[PDB]
UniProtKB/Swiss-Prot annotation, chains A, B:
Annotated protein name in UniProt: Octaketide synthase 1
CDD domains, sorted: CHS_like
Pathway linked to the protein: Secondary metabolite biosynthesis; flavonoid biosynthesis
SUPFAM superfamilies per UniProt: Thiolase-like
Function (record text): Catalyzes the iterative condensations of 8 molecules of malonyl-CoA to produce aromatic octaketides, SEK4 and SEK4b, the products of the minimal polyketide synthase for the benzoisochromanequinone actinorhodin. May be involved in the biosynthesis of the octaketide barbaloin.
């Protein structure tokens, strides 16, 4: 009986985040001296007017510090990486191919420890990075490092950029919900040395990238039908939808070249996202038969902090009070833009605080919330969350 | 009511393949003259014993011809590509980044035509390639070319190699089954110029790659709950599991370098796969509560044709009759090894032949069958299929 098999195979309830772990590489770079370091490490101190421009840009980021897997001494071994576009992909791959699954595994071990169940109960691995590619891929390496079962179903989410924190939640939803007993380990890990490069005055946008991106890894356990008393259900992934904004392909794009990953951006990302986010929010509510709230302040919020300008304009467009993006701005200050890992860090910050503040739910005491990823396309990932009692 | 939303959101029945379309690039290379073409185009005719070995290998492939998006005249423009390892990734990307989604879209158009419903009813896109990477990624480009709805949920399956034909079936199963009304467009497309390179005597394995791989694209429509009288349900995806074989990481591996994609393989792949496939098959049956058949000839078979030696040894291990891999060997002869597309072509060949012969089911008149992907890791994708009345 094929239908009986299907009925027994699938889960009952909504996919639920039940653990979150994070990990950083060891080297801390304060933002207030980053321009000094960067123009020194790229041998560009003669570009004095460029250097002030970059210092002023760094002061506007609302990033306090970032973590990296390299220090100034390390980079001296790679003059090709600190140039603008000398051949360098091979060296970057030699670092990122083993390094990204290793950092991801550090976050995964912490998520598994919080979860408190044996790693042998992990049935699915969703691994996400925009930093390096290889065959067998980074999911294979992470599973090996962690000792997962040999028949774990793996999903390698490569080169999905800054919306991919939303992407992995979308994957984990269907994996957890369609498979009885499934426990999905989600790992996002980024080592931005894949794209680090020297400044070039004809590509000021490529340079601003070096003011934003930092390293980091985050991991979740997602599953349906939590074991009550044992597992800790925090956020239910009710609806997950990806949207492309037409006529915005030139706003953000990144290309894998002989000089590594080359980042490009127009100035239009704040307005493109803010002019389109409302439609994405209505879509995700209407897709589960719900009416969107009249006041967007009724929800809790995990927007991806792609830039402080993006946050400010989305905040204005949605008429949100200044405290609503508190958790997001805290992670941005503490960590910079860790690409896919950010929104998972922010989910962690929000639920930890909500417990510290003894609130009614993990979502700042509110019932419903939205997690948003933004990135190349332009692409929006919109995740409708229902948070649970604390 | 979160659980009411969940019950309304999910589909009822098993994910079903209901359309298949394929497409090749235009240039046909007969295998019996390939060694001549290859050593001429790579300026390697001084390597006389190398050519003799390579011609002998080409005779053993059981490949009749392959399709490519380039001809001999085209390659004269790229002496870096026809070298062994001069810098060439940028040129390869310039071809593959637009070329792979375009070929994929051509196959998708044929699948959508067979399906017969409006493309606006496609809710998910699973796009798969090992030939080039970009941000926004190939799924974005294919969806754009096709004019899919802007909020299609996309899945970009990059760099999963020769097992990825199974991988995309594994993805499509959970997407279709967890989402009421969802229709999943699956696209596999490969342009092997990402890895084409001249011969070097210290890397005979890499050279053997040029005897196996050819270009191609295949597309599926997968959905649960077929609309009877409108849709054509053919194969139900009952169970889908990925397995890694321990201690076989060096058997097949591919690296993205400044010289493009570098293919490597040991001689151990036929025996590594054959010594482990039974365990994978038992796993997929026991995971849905079924006992495996005492005679493997009771099933129909879609093994990936990674090499004729793999097929021969798997056939022997499972004690299969010589005709059981007929559909696979037909595709290998007509097309070579098209990486992720092969098993989808073979499913098309099997269901077309089964209709031509007026058999009882699309699966050669048998009810249960298995589709197998094999690739780097080593990784096995095991897909348990139930075929439907013809």
């Amino acid at each position: 009986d094929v239908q009986g098999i299907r009925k027994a195979q699938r889960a009952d309830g909504t996919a639920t985040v039940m653990a979150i772990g994070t990990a950083h590489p060891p080297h801390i770079f304060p933002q207030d001296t980053y321009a000094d370091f960067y123009f020194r490490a790229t041998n560009s101190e003669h570009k004095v007017e460029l250097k002030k421009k970059f210092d002023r840009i760094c002061k506007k980021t609302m990033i306090g510090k970032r973590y990296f897997n390299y220090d100034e001494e390390f980079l001296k071994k790679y003059p090709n990486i600190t140039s603008f576009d000398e051949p360098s992909l091979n060296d970057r791959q030699d670092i990122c191919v083993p390094g990204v699954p290793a950092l991801g595994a550090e976050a995964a071990v912490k998520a598994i420890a919080e979860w408190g169940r044996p790693k042998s109960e992990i049935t699915h691995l969703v691994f996400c990075t925009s930093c390096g590619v290889d065959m067998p891929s980074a999911d294979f390496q992470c599973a090996k490092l962690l000792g997962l079962r040999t028949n774990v179903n793996k999903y390698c989410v490569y080169m999905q950029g800054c919306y991919a924190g939303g992407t992995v939640m979308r994957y984990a939803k269907d994996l957890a919900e369609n498979n009885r007993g499934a426990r999905v380990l989600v790992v996002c890990a980024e080592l931005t040395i894949i794209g680090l490069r020297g400044p070039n005055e004809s590509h000021l946008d490529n340079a601003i990238g070096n003011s934003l991106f930092g390293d980091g890894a985050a991991a979740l356990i997602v599953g349906s039908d939590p074991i009550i008393g044992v597992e800790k259900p925090m956020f239910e992934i009710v609806c997950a939808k990806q949207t492309v904004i037409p006529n915005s392909e030139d706003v953000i794009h990144l290309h894998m070249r002989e000089a590594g990953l080359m980042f490009y951006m127009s100035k239009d990302s704040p307005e493109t996202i803010s002019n389109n986010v409302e439609a994405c929010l209505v879509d995700v509510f209407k897709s589960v038969g719900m009416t969107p709230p009249e006041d967007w302040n009724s929800l809790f919020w995990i927007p991806h902090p792609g830039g402080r300008a993006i946050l400010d304009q989305v905040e204005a467009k949605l008429k949100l009070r200044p405290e609503k993006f508190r958790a997001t701005r805290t992670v941005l200050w503490d960590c910079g833009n860790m690409v896919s890992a950010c929104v998972l860090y922010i989910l962690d910050e929000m639920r930890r605080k909500s417990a510290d503040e003894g609130l009614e739910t993990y979502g700042e005491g509110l019932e419903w919330g939205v997690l948003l990823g933004f990135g190349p396309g332009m692409t929006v990932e919109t995740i409708l969350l229902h948070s649970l009692p604390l």
